[PDB]
Structures are given as structure tokens and as C-alpha cells.
From a paper:
We construct twistless helix repeat (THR) protein blocks from identical straight α-helices (typically 2–4 helices in each unit); the length of the blocks can be varied simply by varying the number of repeat units. Using X-ray crystallography and electron microscopy, we validate nanomaterial designs ranging from simple polygonal and circular oligomers that can be concentrically nested, up to large polyhedral nanocages and unbounded straight ‘train track’ assemblies with reconfigurable sizes and geometries that can be readily blueprinted.
Expandability over four different sizes was achieved with cage_O43_129 (+0, +4, +8 and +12 helices). The internal structure of the oligomers is clearly resolved in cryo-EM reconstructions for the first three sizes and in ns-EM reconstruction of the largest size; the distance between the centre of mass of the tetramer component to the centre of mass of the trimer component across the different sizes is 7.9, 9.4, 11.3 and 11.7 nm respectively.
Residue numbers in the entry:
A (entry chain O): 1 to 314
B (entry chain b): 522 to 730
C (entry chain T): 163 to 314
Write the structure that this text describes.
């Protein structure tokens, strides 16, 4: 007896009789189905007033929401999302055109204490990157790992630039559970990518370069030097030109033998810029700046010749 | 602009160190804001100039409220200058919307408006004002945010951002009202007004999507 | 006409500790709602809105049972005269602020919906018209009283 079953559900939720009569009045006004009234009962278990529920369901009706999103409003209620923020997430889902699994991910991010603005931003970034619901589910696992919204955004950006699968992002969330910094996760992602690509490339010189970069990254302790070296390893593994491999090898031969971070930062920057460039004149001037750096001995002259080439290439 | 803005802030801080009455401080603050609005309306002609204008207006506003808080003035004067600051800020945001076309700067400008609201609300709450004032200010702040959103908004993403900002302001405001122990009646009144502001924002959103 | 699973759900409102009159009200309400869903009629749906509004806003078991019994009777009837009388009674109950006027108006509408004499329908409709055109609660009560004492 559906109308009485809905009343019994509100009775099991412990709703006051006048407030049952109000939720029934709302059900009669809007034509609420028993599962929409069950969502009202679950918002009542979340302690929301009949008035607030009524305006919320009135808004859901004025939005023309799909019943699955309307049911998922009770999941956002169980996640403890602020009453307005529930409406915001519902509006956002409607504007985004995403599935209820994106709403379940929003509920998980709500349990992780993430604001509706950050959720909306994360979903915005996800659609703008062209990421999928499994990548969004792994992002919710980074939320379970307590990673900050900006760190997730940059991690997702890096994962997209590396062409990673969602399972890779799940492994990144496992490094998050291990308490690894977003920087060190990013390094490990760069490294794993460079290594797998260095299997796919057969070339011993690429493999030497990638090993030398992985050695330098294992020996050093600075996040810029590490990211530059491992990015250079990914770039070397993506490259096909002996001029880029020579410039990178020369830069690594200078850098791995050097004791000052300044010339390492500059030489790795020059090599990364050369590997990203498309002009033989810039490659030759960088190869020249490295030749000048091998034939000279003063670190101030090495830094200046690398600075000239970097300011030409940047 | 930065120089004259700094000169206004400096003069205000000097007057406050000088131990002038809350009434004199408020009068000078209004005059300073009015001048600041005028010289902003003249000198602003670029996205960064609007960003900087808002940053300085909000800065001078924050310093002004901090002076009234430190001298221990009644919340009534604080609420007046809060309204004045928001109203001026809105008029500048209005002008700045004519100068600014890039989505990033439009969004970040709105975000800074919301940060300004969040900060001035937080400052008033730290000022120990009654819920009776907190609701007036919260409502006005939401309504100013609504008017600014209605002025600026022209794509769904910016709508969602403005919505989310509004929603977060409601969340913060309700968190202050909860901390001061305001009655569930006031909590409902404010929350419903927040939902209604979001409903009006959705009535705008219906244009975009 | 509620089947035994409805009675089982009524026993579950018993498990929820709801008072017998409140269970009875909830049964009347849920029945009126399901019937007003099975009927398409916006006027019956308006009556059910206004009844459930009044029942939520008031707190007296006689007023509630009268209102929800009228809502069930409206969901069980089709004649425009009965719908007009019920809407007039609910409009008078929404505009006035005296529980004796509310009880008398609902009682007059219930008697008009249970009976089927067009002279009782017209005298109840005219007593409600006198009550809705006039302002004095004593004239409202004395017109509704004469109509009730003729109709009961």
C-alpha cells in the first residue's frame, strides 16, 4: 500500500506527525514517488527540516532532475554535505551532464571534507582534460588519501600528459596511502613512465640516458632537479633524434659530475628546452653552450653560457 | 593608483594611531572609499587594474574594519562600513565587468569578492556581534554577491563557480551562526534565504544552459 | 478499503509509537493521497493539498479527522457542487482563525459530501456564501449551525 508504506518509512525515520503530514503535503503537491519520499526520509535521518527538504525537492523538480540524481541527494545527505551544497552539487551535476557515479564520487569527496567548489572545480578539470568516471573514482581515492585539491589537479594533469590509465592513478592513491608527497608521487609516475617507455625503445643510448637520469634522481634531493631529470628521461624516451640524445647525454655528463645545483638546474633546463624545441639553430647553440661549458672551467662562465642559451630557447 | 591607494591606507592608519573617535574614523573611511572609487573609475582600464582595484579596496576595507574592532566600536558602525565597502565594491565590480572579457580574470575577480565577504563576515563574528547583525550582513552579502553574479555571469561554468562561492559563503555564515549558538529559527531563516538566493541564481543559470 | 498489508504498515506505525488517532489520520491521509494520485483531477489534488496543509499546521484530532475525512470524501466524489462546497469550506477555514468555525465548516462540507440532496447542497452552499460574505464569527457560526442541524 505505497502511500502508507511511505508513511511507515517516515515513521521508522522517527519523523514528527505534523512533519509527516507536511512531507505528505509536499508529496501530494509535487507528486513525489515513494523512492523520492524515501530520499526525504533519509534527509530526515540526516536531520534536515521538512521545510528545507521541501524547498530542495521543489528545486529538484524545477531543475527537472533524473530520479537517480534525486536518489543520490540522499547519498550527499549521508555524506553530511551542507544543505545548500547538496543543491549546488545537484545543479552542478545537471549543468555538467555527468552520470550518478560522478555524484557518488562527489559523495566520497564530501566524506573526505572537500568543498562543493573544489568538487565542481575537480569535475570541471576532469571534463576539460577529457578524463573518465574511473579516473574520477581514483581521484576520490586521492581524496580518501587526504591529498589537497590543487595536488589532485596537478596529479591528474600530469597523469593526462603521461597518458596514464585509471589503475595508474589508483596506484598513485596507494602511494598517497603510503604518505608519499605529491612531488614524489609525480616523480615516481615520471620514472615509471620513462622506464616502461625505455622498454618500448630498444636503444642502448636512450637506456643509458634514462639510467643516468634515474641515478641522478636517486642521488639528488631537490624537487626541481628531480622533476627536470625525470621529465628529461620521459622526453629522451619519447625522442628519436641523435642531436637531442647527444645534448641530453652531454648535459648529464656535465651535471652528474658537477657538485653545484646551479649548473645542474641550468644544464637540465637547457636540455629540457632543447628536447622540447624544433629548431636546429637552437639545438646547435645549446650544443655550443655545452661545448663552451666543457672547454671552460669557471662555474660563473658555465652558468652564463647556459643562461644565454636558456634565454634564447625559453 | 597603488601609490594613492597606499596613501589613503597610511592616512587612515595614522588617524587610527591618533586615537580619533569611531565616528571620525568612519567618516574618513567613507570619504577615502568614495575617493578610492573615483580614482579607480578613472585609472582602471585593464584586467589587472580591476584586480588591483578590488585588492586595494578590499584591503582598505579590511584595515578599516580592523580599526573599528580594535577601538571596540558598536557593531552598528561596523555594519554601516561593511555595507559601504560592499556597495562601492559592487559599483567597481560593475565598472570592471565592462573592462574585463577573459574567463580566468572574471572568475578570480568574483572569487576575490567572495573572499572579501568571507573575511568581513569572519571579522564581524570575531568582533562579537549578535546573530541579529550577523544575519543582516550575511543576507546583504549574499544579495550583493547575487547582484554581482547577475552582472558578470555569461557562461554555465562561471555560473557554477559563482553558485559554489555563494554556497560556500552560506556554509561559512551558518558555521558562525552555529558557533555563536543562534536559534534553529534564525538558522532556518538564513538557510532558506541562501537556498532562495541559489534558486534566483538558478533562474539566471536557466539563461545559460 | 485498505488491504491487510496496509494494516501491517499501520501496525508498523504502532511499532513507531504513533497514537491511534494519529495512525488513523495517517491512514486517512495516505488513502486520500493514493486516491488523488489515481484520480487525475487537479481540483481534488488542490483539496488534498489544502487539507494536508491544514492538518500539518493545526494540531487537534477532531479538526484533523474532519479535514482528512472530507479529503477522502472528495476523492470519493465527482459533482462540482460538492467540490465547490469543500473548496469554500477550506477557503473559509484558511481565512478564519476560530476552531469552532473550522469544525462547523468542515462538518457542513462532510454532511454535504455524505448526503445526496440538492436542497441540502444549495442551503449548505448558501450558508457558506453567507459565512464568506459576512465578517462576524457569530453570524458565521449561526448560519453553519442551522445548515448542520438541517443536514445531520
Amino acid at each position: 500500500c505505497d502511500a502508507i508504506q511511505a508513511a511507515a518509512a517516515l515513521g521508522e525515520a522517527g519523523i514528527s506527525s505534523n512533519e509527516i503530514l507536511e512531507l505528505l503535503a509536499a508529496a501530494a503537491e509535487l507528486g513525489l514517488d515513494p523512492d523520492a519520499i524515501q530520499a526525504a526520509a533519509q534527509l530526515g535521518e540526516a536531520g534536515i527540516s521538512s521545510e528545507e527538504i521541501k524547498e530542495l525537492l521543489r528545486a529538484a523538480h524545477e531543475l527537472g532532475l533524473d530520479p537517480d540524481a534525486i536518489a543520490a541527494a540522499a547519498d550527499l545527505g549521508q555524506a553530511g554535505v551542507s544543505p545548500v551544497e547538496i543543491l549546488a552539487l545537484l545543479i552542478a551535476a545537471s549543468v555538467l551532464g555527468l552520470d550518478p557515479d560522478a555524484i557518488q564520487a562527489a559523495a566520497a569527496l564530501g566524506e573526505a571534507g572537500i568543498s562543493a567548489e573544489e568538487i565542481i572545480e575537480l569535475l570541471t578539470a576532469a571534463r576539460d582534460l577529457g578524463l573518465d568516471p574511473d579516473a574520477i573514482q581514483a581521484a576520490a581515492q586521492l581524496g580518501e588519501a587526504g591529498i589537497s585539491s590543487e595536488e589532485i589537479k596537478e596529479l591528474l594533469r600530469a597523469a593526462h600528459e603521461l597518458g596514464l590509465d585509471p589503475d595508474c592513478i589508483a596506484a598513485a592513491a596507494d602511494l598517497g596511502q603510503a604518505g608519499i608527497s605529491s612531488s614524489e608521487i609525480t616523480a615516481l609516475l615520471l620514472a615509471a613512465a620513462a622506464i616502461e617507455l625505455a622498454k618500448r625503445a630498444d636503444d642502448k643510448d636512450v637506456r643509458e640516458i634514462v639510467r643516468d637520469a634515474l641515478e641522478l634522481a636517486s642521488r639528488s634531493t631537490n624537487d626541481e632537479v628531480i622533476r627536470l631529470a625525470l621529465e628529461a628521461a620521459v622526453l629522451a624516451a619519447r625522442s628519436t633524434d641523435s642531436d637531442v640524445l647527444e645534448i641530453v647525454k652531454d648535459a648529464l655528463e656535465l651535471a652528474k659530475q658537477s657538485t653545484n645545483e646551479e649548473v645542474i638546474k641550468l644544464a637540465l633546463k637547457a636540455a629540457v628546452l632543447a628536447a622540447k624545441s624544433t629548431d636546429e639553430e637552437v639545438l646547435e647553440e645549446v650544443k655550443e653552450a655545452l661545448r663552451r661549458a666543457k672547454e671552460s672551467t669557471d662555474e660563473e662562465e658555465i652558468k652564463e653560457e647556459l643562461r644565454k642559451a636558456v634565454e634564447e630557447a625559453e | 593608483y597603488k601609490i594613492v591607494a597606499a596613501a589613503a591606507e597610511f592616512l587612515l592608519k595614522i588617524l587610527a594611531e591618533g586615537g580619533a573617535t569611531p565616528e571620525q574614523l568612519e567618516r574618513v573611511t567613507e570619504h577615502a572609499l568614495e575617493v578610492l572609487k573615483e580614482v579607480a573609475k578613472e585609472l582602471a582600464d585593464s584586467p589587472e587594474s580591476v584586480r588591483e582595484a578590488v585588492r586595494l579596496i578590499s584591503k582598505l576595507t579590511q584595515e578599516g574594519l580592523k580599526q573599528l574592532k580594535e577601538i571596540g566600536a558598536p557593531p552598528e558602525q561596523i555594519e554601516r562600513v561593511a555595507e559601504h565597502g560592499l556597495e562601492v565594491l559592487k559599483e567597481i565590480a560593475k565598472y570592471g565587468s565592462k573592462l574585463t572579457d577573459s574567463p580566468e580574470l572574471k572568475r578570480e575577480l568574483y572569487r576575490i569578492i567572495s573572499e572579501t565577504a568571507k573575511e568581513l563576515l569572519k571579522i564581524l563574528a570575531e568582533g562579537g556581534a549578535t546573530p541579529e547583525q550577523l544575519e543582516r550582513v550575511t543576507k546583504h552579502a549574499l544579495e550583493v554577491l547575487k547582484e554581482v553574479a547577475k552582472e558578470l555571469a555569461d557562461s554555465p561554468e562561471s555560473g557554477l563557480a559563482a553558485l559554489a562561492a555563494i554556497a560556500s559563503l552560506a556554509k561559512l555564515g551558518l558555521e558562525q551562526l552555529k558557533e555563536i549558538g543562534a536559534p534553529p529559527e534564525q538558522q532556518r531563516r538564513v538557510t532558506k534565504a541562501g537556498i532562495e538566493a541559489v534558486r534566483e541564481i538558478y533562474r539566471y543559470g536557466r539563461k545559460l544552459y
